[PDB]
């Protein structure tokens with residue numbers, strides 16, 4: 001079933017998420033990514049409309065799949081005795097945002113705006129579909145280098161979106177908000193906005209602003225690179241200590257720094273090609 005339909009390529013990476021391989025769908029040569037996750041390492045389980053026990057990640061990916069290219073599409077999945085296998089679409093050529101920022105250092109604001117805007121559209125789409133990612137970061141964003149389009153990946157820490165408090169968290173700590181650090185409590189939207197503030201800082205400064213818990217709790221932002229006052233303001237707003245002081249997604253996208261975003265293709269022509 002898996003063997004015949006897909007031709008396995010090299011390992012693309014591995015970690016807390018499992019092991020992901022390059023691959024090709026044999027029927028039409030479609031480029032794909034093949035993610036293997038061991039069952040013992042899955043603590044968050046969900047159920048399909050069919051009534052079948054699967055990893056929450058599969059539920060979340062099905063809920064966000066559509067023609068919209070801002071989220072990585074789940075093409076298929078398979079259960080094995082001790083693992084699940086996910087077949088994901090794979091852009092070609094591609095580079096993840098962490099590697100891209102490592103190579104370039106701090107991104108020009110025009111590029112950061114285009115990239116951040118697309119992440120915002122992608123995250124809004126997830127929320128609109130009832131899905132909370134809970135691990136927004138550069139390592140979980142792929143750049144389609146030809147078209148200049150970003151894609152969200154890895155819903156392995158995600159959850160169904162809800163309006164009540166979350167008391168579990170399995171995402172990346174240095175992107176997690178002060179209310180999680182201090183109280184082990186957060187709400188979905190406002191926690192996401194905090195991670196977006198960390199991400200934007202990372203884009204325009206070349207690295208994340210906080211390393212230790214005490215830095216997260218103090219929430220004092222120091223700019224290590226030249227960043228415009230408008231961008232600094234948006235960053236500090238997203239990183240407001242009190243969750244209710246953070247901007248809504250609407251307020252982020254209406255912020256003056258976010259005006260006149262480049263289209264993805266224009267972004268590729270100017271900054272990537």
Ligand SMILES: C[C@H]1NC(=O)c2cc(-c3cccc4c(=O)n(C)c(NC(C)(C)C)nc34)[nH]c21
Pocket residue numbers: 012013014017020032033035072088089090091094095096139140142153154155156
């Ligand atoms: C981070 C990891 N966790 C996931 O759920 C997932 C999916 C991919 C993924 C999907 C499609 C294409 C790619 C790809 O082309 N590359 C190069 C990578 N590389 C990393 C992120 C594994 C280093 N992942 C892809 N990577 C991950």
